[PDB]
Symmetry: T
Subunit: 118 residues, 12 copies
C-alpha cells in the first residue's frame, strides 16, 4: 500500500499535492511511522530534539514522518524533522505524514497552530 | 541599469537596506526576473515548488527574485526562493526582488501577509 | 500517468532507453514541463541561461525536461539542463523530455541539429 | 563557572532544557558574550547582519550567544545567529544566551515579541 | 546526571574504557535512551533499519546508545547505530549504552553472541 | 519487470525484507546484473577489487547487485559492492541481488559462509 | 609491466602524451582492463550506461580503460568512462586505454568517429 | 579599466551576451590575462594541460581568460579553462576572454574551429 | 564610497594592489568595520579568538576587515581573520582593511611588527 | 626499495595481491613504519585508539601501516587504521604493512585471530 | 580520569589556550597521555615534522595527542597543524607537551623551536 | 627523468628529504615548470600575478610545488600548497631548479621576499 502511494507521490512534480489529492480520493494514509515510547508526558511541542508527547499527542521519529525522506527525494523547504521527534495530536495520529504537511508550528509557543496553540 | 543597482547592493554591508534606500530615493526596481507561463489556477501560496499563481498574481522564477542570488552573494535567512516559484500580487509584480524583501509569508496561510492572507 | 512512466524509467538499467521503448509503444509523453514567458525573438539556441526562444520555439525550465532530473536519479552525460532554459521546436514541444533525449546541440552554433543548426 | 554550565548542557539530551533548569534553580547566566560597539541608533530588530541596537538595547556577536555554538554541539532548528548580531533589551543584557532561547522574533516586525514588536 | 559520566568519557583518550571503568566502580548506567514500538515480533536482530525486537527484547534508537554519539566526539569503528534501531534483551536493558559496547554481533545470525546467536 | 519489483522495495521501510517477501510469494528475481568475462581461476572470494570467480562461481559488477544502488536509495550498513566485483555460486547466479542479501562473508576465509568457507 | 608504464605516465606533465610517446617507442599496451560478458547485440555506441557492444566490439568496464583512473591522478576531461562501459572495435581490444585516448565519440550518433559513425 | 566591464557583466543575467554587446559598442576588451612562455612549440591544441602554442599562437592562463572566472561568478559550462592553458591566434591575442566565448574547439582534432581545425 | 571601492578592487587581478593604488590617489578607506566594546585588558595581540585589545588599540570583527571577505571573492591564502578578532592601533583604526594588508604579525609575540613587537 | 615496491603496488589493479606476489618472490617488506614508544602494559587488542601493546607486541602508527595510505591510493575496506594504533606480534613486527593485510581481527575478543584470540 | 577535568574546563572556555595557561599558572597538573615515538634521535631536530625527527635533546610525540584543540574535541584557530605530523620537544620540557607547543614558536627559517634550536 | 625522481619522492615517507638526497647524489633537477611571460614587478617570492623583477623568473605556482607535482597531500603548516594558483618569482641565478628552490628557501614574513635573495 505504502509503495503505491509513495511511488505516485515521489515522481509527481509536487509530492505534497499528490498525497493530498490521493487522500482526497479516499486513498489510505501512509502507515509504518515509528512511534516512540515515553514514560512521562512532555512539553507537547510540535518538533523536538527528544520525544515530547503530552496528554493529547504521540511522538513519532521525525524522518519517519517527513514525506520527502519517505519518498527518498530532495527537499523543498534536509528533513527539518530528520533526527528529531514529531508530536502529533492523537486524533490525527492515523496520518502522521499528512499531518505535518497540513499544519503549522507556532513560532511563539512552538505547538501546532489549531491544536494546542496559544 | 541592473548592474549599477546590483553592484551597489552587492558590496553593501547590508544589501537589503541598500536596495531599500536606493528605491527610497526614486531608484528603479531591478528588472529581468523570469515569469512563468502558467494557467493561473494555482493555490496562491507565496513560495511553491511549481507555479501556483492565482488570478491576481504572477509566478516568477525563484532565483530571479532573490536579491542575494542576483548579487551573487551569501544569504542571511539559502535562497528559500531558489529552485522554487514565487507568486507575487499582480499590482506589485513591477518590483519582485523588492516584494519578497518587504513582505512576510503567513506561516499559517502560505500566502503573503497583507495580500491574500486570511 | 506521469508517475507511472517516470517510475518505469527511473528503475530501468537504461532510463533513456526505457522511455524510448515506452514511447515506441504509443505511451503518452511526460507532461508538466514548466514553460517560460518570453519575447520569442531570442537567439533560438537549444540551451541557454535565460529564455532565448525564437518564433518557432518554446522555452522550458531545463530541469523539467531532464528525464534524470525528473526521475530523481544520477546521470550519464548533473544534467546540463538544470538551471537553464531549453528552447524547443513548437511542433516538437508536445514532448520536451524526449526531444532533448533524441537530439543534439551543434558545438558550433549551439542550435539543435536538424532544427536550427547551420 | 561558564565551563561548568556549558559542560552540563552540552552532554544533556536537550541542552536548552538543561540550561533552562539550571537558571530556574538559581544558576548564574552564561557570561563572556561579545558586546558590539555601536551608536545605538539602529532599527532595533532582533537579529541583523550589522549591529542595530537602539537606545534600549545592546548588540552582541551572534555566536557569543548561541548556546549550541558555546557548547560545541550540532544544532536543532547552523547558529542562525553565527555571523549576525543580536540586539537585546538592556534590562536583559545579563543573560543574552538564555534570552534568545526564551524569546521569539516577529516574522513581520523582525523585532522581539514583547520587546519592541508591534 | 548523565552529563558527569559523559563528560569523563568524552575527554578520556579511550571513552569506551573510561565508561567501563566507571561502571566497574559501581557507577550508574547512562540513562535517557529512546525506545520505539515494534510492529509485531521482529527478527530479533541486534541492529536494524527498523525496530525488530523479539518478545524478549526492546528496540532502542541507535544514536541514543552509541556512546560516541552521546559524547559528541568522532568515532573509532560512524555510529553503526545512528539512524538504525538496536534490539536489546529486556533483562539487560537497564544499560543500553554499555550493552552494545560489551557485546558482539554475529556476522552470520545478526543476533548478539550470547543472546540469540546460533 | 524489474521496475515493478525494484519500485516496490525502494519504498518499503525495509527494502531487503520486502524483496525477501516478494521472492517468498514466488516473485521473479531481479535481473540485468552486468556479468563479467572471467577465467574462473581466481581466489574465489566473495567481494573483490577485480573479477575473481573460481570454477564454481560467476562474476558480476557490484552495483548491479546492491539492492540499494539499484533502487536508487541510500544505504544502511556505500555499496560495499559499488566499484568492486561480487563472486556468485553458479547455482545461485540467477538471483545475485538476493544472494548478497541472505549471505554472510566470512571475516577470515573471505568467502561466503556456507558456499566456500573453511 | 603496467606499473612501469603507468608510473611513468602518472607523473609526466601530460600523462596522455606520455602514453602516446611510450606506445610509439614500441611500448607494450596497458593490460588488465575488465572485459564484460555481453550480448553483442547492443547499439554499438562508444560509451554507455550498460554493455552495448555489437558483433564487432567488446565491452570493457569504463574505469579500467581511463588512463587517469588507472594512474590515480586528476582529470582534463571526469572519466566520462568511470561507471560506464566502453565498446571497442575487437581489432583494437588490445589497447583499450589507448583507443579512447586516440579516438572521438560522435556527438550526433554517439559512436566512435571512424568506427561506426555516420 | 577591467573593473567597469567585469562588474557590468558580473551582474548581467547573461554575462556572455553583456560582454558581447559591450564590445559591439567599441568597448575595450578585457585585459591582464597571464601569458605563458612557451619556448619551443606545442601541438597547437586550443585547450591543453600544458602550454602548446604554435608559431601563430600565444599561451594564456586558463583562468585569466575565463569570463566567469574573471568575474567571480558561477558557470553555464568550474570553467574548463581553469588550471589549463589556452592557445589563441596571435592576431586575436588582444581579447583572449572574448575569443574563447566566440569560438569552438573541434572535438576531433582539439583545435579551434576556423583557426586551425583541419 | 564602499561599494565603489570594493567593486573596483573585487574585479582587479590583484585586489590588494588595487586598493593600495586607490588609496595613493587620495581615495577614502573602506568603512563600516564593526568594532567590539571591551575592557581593554587584552594581550594586545594582532589576531585573536576573543577581543584582546589593549589601551592603544581597537578590536574589529575579523571579517569586517578581510578585503576579500568584504569583496565577496576567493582568497590568495580561508579568511584567517574570519571568525577571529583583529586588534588595530587606535591611530590606524581609520583604515582597518588596509592596515592588515600593509602590516605583518610577528611570529614570536603575535603582535603587529612595528606596533608592539619586541 | 620502499618507493620501488610501493610504486609497483600502487599501480596494480589489485595492490594487495601485488604486494603479496612481491613478498612471495623473496621481496623485502615495506619499512619505515612508525613505532610507538610505550610501556607494554596494554590490552593487546589488534586495532585501538591508543597504544595497547602487551609484552609480546609492538605498537605502530596505523596509517604508516595501511598499504593504501602508504601508496596514496583509495581503499577496498577508509584506512580503518589511520588515526589509530596497530598491535603486531613481535615475531611479525618486521612486516607491519603485510601482517594486517594477511590477518583478521576477532570480532569478539578484538585480537588477531591466531595471535591472541580466545 | 585526571585530564578530563582540565580538558573539560578549557574546552568550554572562550579561549581554551588561555584557560590552560591560567590552569598551570595556578599549579595545575599538565595534561598527560601524549603518545611518544620511538625514533633514531639523530633526526633533524626540527619542531614540527612529517616523520619523527628528534635529536638526542628531544622526544618525538604524536602531534594530535599534543594539540589541545584536538584533545578537547573542538575546532581550531591556528585542523591541527600538528595532526598527522610529529612534534619534537626538548627532553627537559617533555613533562608538558600540550603546553610547550602553545607557549613556543617555530623559526620560519630553520624550522626549529625559537629558544631551543634556531640560530 | 622527471617521472623517475617524482616517483621516488612520491612514495617516500618524507618527499622533501627524498628529493634533497636525490639532488645531493648529483641527481638532476626536476624540469618542466611553466615559465611566465612578464615584464618590473615587486620581486616578491609568491604573488597572485607575475611579479618578477630583473633578477628573477616568474613560474606558475603548481609547477614548483613538489607535492603538487607528486600528486600527494601537503605538509605546509595546515592547508594548501601556497604556490598553487599563485606565481613564484625565483632568482634567475637559481631558476635551474625551481621545485627545489622553494623547498630550500624561506619567504620573509615582513618584506615578502626570499630570505637571502631580496629580503631586507
Ligand atoms: Zn526531510
Ligand atoms: Zn502559539
Ligand atoms: Zn538566495
Ligand atoms: Zn494567513
Ligand atoms: Zn539531471
Ligand atoms: Zn550549427
Ligand atoms: Zn549555532
Ligand atoms: Zn511585529
Ligand atoms: Zn557513532
Ligand atoms: Zn549467529
Ligand atoms: Zn550500495
Ligand atoms: Zn573462513
Ligand atoms: Zn578519469
Ligand atoms: Zn555520427
Ligand atoms: Zn569559470
Ligand atoms: Zn578538426
Ligand atoms: Zn578571507
Ligand atoms: Zn615580536
Ligand atoms: Zn587506508
Ligand atoms: Zn577472539
Ligand atoms: Zn589541531
Ligand atoms: Zn634560524
Ligand atoms: Zn601541494
Ligand atoms: Zn625581509
Amino acid at each position: 500500500a505504502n509503495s503505491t502511494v509513495l511511488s505516485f507521490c515521489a515522481f509527481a512534480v509536487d509530492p505534497a499535492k499528490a498525497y493530498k489529492d490521493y487522500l482526497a480520493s479516499g486513498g489510505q494514509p501512509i502507515t509504518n511511522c515509528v512511534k516512540m515510547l515515553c514514560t512521562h508526558t512532555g512539553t507537547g511541542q510540535a518538533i523536538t530534539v527528544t520525544p515530547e508527547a503530552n496528554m493529547d499527542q504521540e511522538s513519532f521519529g521525525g524522518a519517519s514522518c517527513c514525506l520527502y525522506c519517505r519518498c527518498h527525494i530532495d527537499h523543498p523547504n534536509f528533513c527539518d524533522l530528520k533526527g528529531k521527534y514529531v508530536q502529533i495530536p492523537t486524533t490525527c495520529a492515523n496520518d502522521p505524514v499528512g499531518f505535518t504537511l497540513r499544519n503549522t508550528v507556532c513560532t511563539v509557543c512552538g505547538m501546532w497552530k489549531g491544536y494546542g496553540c496559544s
